[model samples]
Target chain A: QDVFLLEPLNCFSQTFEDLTCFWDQLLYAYRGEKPRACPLYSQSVPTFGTRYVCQFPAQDEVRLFFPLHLWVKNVSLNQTLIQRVLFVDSVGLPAPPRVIKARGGSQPGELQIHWEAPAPEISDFLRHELRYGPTDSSNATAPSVIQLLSTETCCPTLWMKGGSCLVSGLQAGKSYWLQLRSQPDGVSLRGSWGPWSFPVTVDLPGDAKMVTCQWQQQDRTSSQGFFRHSRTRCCPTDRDPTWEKCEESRCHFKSRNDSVIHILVEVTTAQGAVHSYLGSPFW
Target chain B: PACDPRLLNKLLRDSHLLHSRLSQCPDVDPLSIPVLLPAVDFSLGEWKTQTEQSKAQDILGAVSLLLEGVMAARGQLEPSCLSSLLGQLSGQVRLLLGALQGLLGTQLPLQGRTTAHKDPNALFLSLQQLLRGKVRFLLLVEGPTLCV
Candidate 1:
């Protein structure tokens, strides 16, 4: 008469080694002082409508695919409730990814999104997706899907959630809203798609365009000229472990380690400042 | 038009998503239904002499047929959820196949019995195995031994 969902939205635990079932049924019977309690069953403080859980130790060998039959005896009803549950189809569903940071990338017509998998246990195996659409579109409900393309490094959940994705093919002078969802899969870990993230809105600068950087020499650069601009500046995302500065759009930069450079070319204009990246040929 | 390199990964992820959803629905016994289709091998046989575009194209053609078979067989099993799952799964295949055209893919025009198909779970395993093989093949060979 009752149903059990594994971690969140799944019927069975994916690991197969350990099994945990959760449900929040009204365990009330008029006779007892606590009103509803199972003799051997324990419960947690409510997460979602008085959720109760049952945990079992890992199995040495387990059967899968088919549903497992479960029996629970209720003293009040003077009978037992039977439950049937299935194993992972592949793996369980994913937890929604949270978008904690958003802004423009250091490139023309690009948006930078930073997100983290809410579930720490499966963070590493998760792949986050970005679905976006123009805020002004009549079909605003329809958004284009973009999977996290660039492969970044990860750590334990402390920073394992540090997932970053750059969305390109964007046009300036447009307003766009983006939402994220995550899926988990690996040789070891796998799961279904999670819920959509809280939608994040973004406004791209109207005066977005490219900025040309004059390459001068071995770590030497030149500025072509900026007449219609008030200010021009450039700097890579990663600074050397030392102090270096440049004014008037170029730098006499030096590097001791390998790094992919994204020199900034943010020009403030009437429409707003446009931040575009200008890469230099390092010889 | 340039294709997203990691797009294959997206298709793979969604396949699992769609299958898991199909398996989790109530009132229908998953064991009774095949989660995959009986379709052509996703490897697109004898592709050694062909281009990556040609290799992937035929696989796409096979994908189209596998999908066509699902629609042919679907008779309102779980109209709401299974319909949406099939819809999304279909759209994903279309997207990936279209992306494959940048490489020259096909939709394999059903061609009657030659590309005829069956149920789900078997088709899914075939798709996963073939694609995962391609991924592994790209990693090492993309050469000399056991990539099959």
Candidate 2:
């Protein structure tokens, strides 16, 4: 999970300087133009107070802790409340790197994503739609779409071995069919789509993998009931089966191997809700 | 003979002065008794009409006892005895003041709980005021004494 923890005094990021500058700019937003305190630094920075502003570049789905206790009054206009997006990389990562148990190093490149559907409490899932103009094509990339590699009655898979489709290597400034779908509510089809989701343009390279999978758990629902449908259930035996099942009309998964792994996630919806995903890593 | 009225008055005045100063005695250490340890006969309890020859001797004895109490308390020994003597001296002084004031006050012939003597309401009001004052004073004094 991507974590931007409250680092010690010296551990500043590139945005640290920008944060300082942003705080300076916020002082004018209020009347009297008083010198406000900066929330990032405690003692190292000047004792004066400063205002703070932050933005989430994309609809990032991860647990974020914005602990700016200083005179932070608001987020940027483009920024949505942490609740708007559902999949939190920090809380929802298949493996929280710090505690992950696996043979591979914790490096993001080599690391195998060990993800479990996040709890609905700390996470949410959401889809966004955008329109593109033909004139804007010169400056912007065209939208990308998901195409299932095999005719398995599912949406396209990008990581299929020796597989290419109509939308392969989509170019900049082009129009394409972009549909983000979710699995049938609580339906577990290994490598399957939920159905076509709200269409949004994939103008950015990062938007390619637009689809999302989530498992939502309701707090009011009794955990003791038919909630035992994870792939890792009845595990640790030779030739463990994929017992992963879906309930409450959402998708979920589990591992059949006995090797130790960790997954963390946040589940969300287009509209925020109180429920969260629930499950643990398997060995 | 020393039967002159002025002489009698002088003696009483001198006694009153001594009593007043002694009543307001500062806290004393048993070790400090050596500084002003008066003779035992000077004790106020024993200060009754005495012959000329025995007067000095009586005063000396009372003074000595006072000194002994002070010495015991200051030395961190027999603290209870010292406290008792101090308390007695203080109470006696208060009584003496009350008697002096009564002698100076206007007196009426009517006695007992009679309405003719003084207004019953006034008497009750004065008593209540005095009782409240005494209680408050006692509490304030006791708080510091116990704490220190």
Candidate 3:
């Protein structure tokens, strides 16, 4: 019977295109000779014990055996010993997915979530898992059901631009949190689900006042302070107006490119009414 | 070879000295130091071979050049910038010494194969590790508090 794999050879994979495995064993008991060459690629590990890694080449039915040998003076002769004998029957879990961006969608009660695959260390063989649930105003509670959220298979096409999906059933004026993970595809191998990503909160759009404005003047005077300072003088007839009248409860301020201007803004929403206030006029 | 305390302490002390001087300047931007110095791609390939003496020597040369670059920018850069640049240099030195340690095994008799009685690789590793820890703590943990 074959002895168990050394502690270093912890994970292996067969379905991957390259048929690679990860081992972190440190060769401590050194004598005369150490294994240096492998079938395809071999390299040393950083920040650990003296280590070597093996990566086999690409081909179907590429059966190969890895042999390890150590030479000691006046003790043992040269013989190839099978250090680890394990079949590439399965692969392991993909790393956790990363949330690139999460924000409110265009339409009401719609939330959009964008994410990408895990880091390169273990992302190649992964399909993504997404789970989301709304939290109350306290933001402490989350949906506790396991089999409720739908499972979606990850497509490689969407991995680059960040995998995107829309949650349309979100309640308006409420906050929802989403988290994602990655799992190996069953055809190639089997792996446990990775840890979920940090929770992202998405607030759905509700019926709120939409106020927008642009500067009326194409360019502000260099003499007047720019966006970081408040302008004191009112508009002169010869010079272009600096402030535009409030339209749709929104007003605009323009500043010169060279100067600085500062502005403060405050918004208040009532249960059944809308209110607006103008800044005190400067002479 | 047993590590040398005096030689190791020199590098650590010099690193701290540079870091303290740089922290006094206010105009330096820490993030920009990476580009101001000469561009060198840092990776395992830079110091992987154990049999080659030239490979290890080349990295030592690079470390000197980085130190020189920081010195050149000392008076002109902001304190934060100096700290950031030195932080990166300290980390690089640590890595270089690590590679040297792997190439030249620890506890080898220095005079047996060569003339000089020195275990410079071990000393460099010790100095770089100490300097790296101090710089990281200052930059990552106490930076915001100090800025305010």
Which candidate leads the pack in TM-score?
1
What CAPRI-style quality would you assign to candidate 1? incorrect
Model 2 C-alpha lDDT per residue in residues A236-265, reported as the tens digit of each score: 222122232332234333434444432322
Query: What DockQ would you assign to candidate 3?
Result: 0.01
State the lDDT of candidate 1 residue by residue for A51-112, as single tens digits.
Answer: 55654433211222222334444557757464433333234445555644556544446565
Name the best candidate (by lDDT). Answer: 1
Clashes of each: 9, 70, 17
Alpha-carbon RMSD, candidate 3 = 20.2
Off by over 4 Å in 2: A1-120, A125-140, A146-283, B1-148
A244: Cα error in model 3, Å: 20
How far residue A61's Cα lies from its native spot in candidate 1, in Å, is: 17
Pick by lDDT: 1 or 3, better one: 1
Instruction: Give DockQ per model, in order.
Output: 0.02, 0.01, 0.01
Clashing pairs in 1: B34-B121, B35-B120, B35-B121, B36-B119, B36-B120, B36-B121, B36-B123, B37-B119, B37-B123
How does residue A164 of candidate 2 score in lDDT? Answer: 14
